[PDB]
Amino acid sequence: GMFITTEGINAGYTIKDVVEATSSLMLASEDIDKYNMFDQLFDEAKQKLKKKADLLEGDGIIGLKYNTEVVEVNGAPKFLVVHGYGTVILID
Template sequence: MFMSTEEVNAGHTIIGIVSATSRIMLAADEIDQYQMFDQLIEETKQKLTKRAKLKDGDGLIGVHFNTEVVNVSVAPKFLVVVGYGTVVKLDK
């Protein structure tokens, strides 16, 4: 299974689009732990790969990740990563 932010230079058929979200709640003493986005991106990539396999895809193209810090007035901060991409099947 491959994943790319660009197109592929091989014949392929578009199967569909998949998306995935990962999040983590930060405790009060962890409010500046933004390096945790790396962990969340890896988790999101694994979820995207699993969903692409369920669609019988060979890979994902046009993959993007959005990161966000969510502040909730009565709770700690959340770090959220949303990923999405196009599932493709390579031509044989």
């Protein structure tokens, strides 16, 4: 139960660290149109980032951004990759 946001917050905080997480999956040959499968990778990336924020003893993560790639092998999409990153903060 730890907060996450794309932008900053108007409140007093100190900065613990910037954290990053990558998650990925492999597509079946028949599923090369299934870009909806990115949904689970964003949620996995967030949970990895939140766990890292909790290990740093922060209250949450500001400044979240995502990078995405669709990686091709032998002229077909084969991997979907999300990178998430943000700044872990502690309020006051």
